[PDB]
């Protein structure tokens with residue numbers, strides 16, 4: 187039905203520009219977070235930006251949770267990006283709100 | 299009796315100063331730090347003194363750490379201290395947990411904690427003897443005694459502040475001297491959490507509902523064309 | 524225009540000491556003779572007396588068991604008539620210059 191319009195929207199360059207902007211701001215967040223002052227202080231901007239980034243990544247996974255896995259299960263870059271999404275979503279899901287047993291932190295800069 | 303020439307010292311082989319956190323040249327003129335209402339119940343406030351203490355030890359959050367104490371006679375290092383000792387807070391904060399809770403430490407005589415009232419070599423009777431009339435009301439009550447033959451430490455909190463550990467040597471067979479000292483540590487954590495009741499999954503489902511609403515709004519965009 | 528072997532550090536002085544310039548500013552109008560002496564000596568190895576100042580300034584409490592030598596600027600030639608005085612508060616009863 188509306189799958190043609192959805193594919194036209196995802197082929198539009200504005201969504202790509204927006205998502206590129208969000209992940210470049212994530213790159214700048216990592217650049218500022220490799221420091222110590224912005225790591226835990228003056229970090230309300232860090233919190234709201236990270237919430238925006240995980241919202242954008244959830245939206246991207248919702249776009250890739252379509253019937254397109256029939257091609258995202260045999261291709262090249264496609265399987266790589268969906269696996270990247272999975273091994274992004276799961277670790278910060280069990281890390282940012284952990285409440286569990288774990289050794290220490292070694293996958294924050296790795297996730298970024 | 300006691301030997302008056304003995305004293306206990308806590309090592310400070312690397313201090314928090316002389317790098318990009320704090321400098322020694324500034325603390326002595328009333329460099330006063332904050333307590334975020336976590337000791338007893340309000341606007342508590344602590345005054346570090348450089349002349350009394352100096353540059354405090356630096357520690358990190360969620361790191362199993364113990365202080366290593368040396369015994370001094372006539373101002374001379376002779377032997378690191380090995381007996382059982384306890385720590386306390388003069389300000390009265392609880393924002394730090396302990397290691398293995400005396401169960402894997404093979405305690406058997408219901409070890410007393412920091413609730414019986416000041417601990418010293420007189421009031422203390424250990425829990426590794428075979429006292430017969432108080433074995434356990436204790437699945438996992440912690441072990442507020444460090445050093446000795448056990449291997450339990452302090453896990454630190456995320457307060458990101460200065461701590462003034464009041465340390466007392468506790469074993470009544472090391473000496474008649476009430477060995478006591480006060481030293482200063484400072485924790486450097488990673489990240490405070492202000493997420494509250496909105497979870498990651500909660501924000502996820504909020505975003506899914508909003509995206510489905512956007513899809514239901516964009517369906518008439520195709521319908522009208 | 525004069526310096527010495529070493530600095531405030533590399534000599535074991537944990538805390539801040541007192542130098543010639545510091546004592547000259549300390550004493551406003553009295554001549555240089557009464558500025559410093561054993562009647563006003565306080566050690567650098569204190570942790571309790573004077574100051575946790577910055578470390579790295581030139582150090583002139585030179586003595587034996589230290590290698591501390593004198594130094595002059597390399598370029599111009601000149602003479603600097605120096606009088607040496609012992610600073611120890613409890614060595615001898617008199618003045619020795």
Ligand SMILES: *[C@@H]1O[C@H](CO)[C@@H](O[C@@H]2O[C@H](CO)[C@@H](O[C@@H]3O[C@H](CO)[C@@H](O)[C@H](O)[C@@H]3O)[C@H](O)[C@H]2NC(C)=O)[C@H](O)[C@H]1NC(C)=O
Nearest residue numbers: 408409410411412413414434435436437438439440441442
């Ligand atoms: C400090 O040590 C004392 C022992 O001298 C501890 O008191 C004992 O604590 C245990 C576990 O907390 C109690 O066992 C259980 O208590 C709960 C109620 O909290 C009850 O529902 C269970 O059925 C079981 O009885 C034990 O009764 C209690 N004994 C006494 C005499 O109070 C104390 O908890 C320790 N506190 C700290 C902070 O380590």
Ligand SMILES: *[C@@H]1O[C@H](CO)[C@@H](O[C@@H]2O[C@H](CO)[C@@H](O)[C@H](O)[C@H]2NC(C)=O)[C@H](O)[C@H]1NC(C)=O
Nearest residue numbers: 527528529530532533534589590591592593594
């Ligand atoms: C100050 O300069 C003197 C140069 O006169 C240096 O003296 C040397 O010190 C070493 C270390 O004990 C001796 O082995 C040499 O024999 C000394 N040489 C001379 C010519 O005296 C001294 O190292 C300098 N001090 C500092 C802190 O750099």
Ligand SMILES: *[C@@H]1O[C@H](CO)[C@@H](O)[C@H](O)[C@H]1NC(C)=O
Nearest residue numbers: 325326327328329330345347
């Ligand atoms: C800090 O305390 C010292 C002595 O306790 C006092 O001389 C000084 O004025 C105080 N400074 C401030 C800012 O409170």
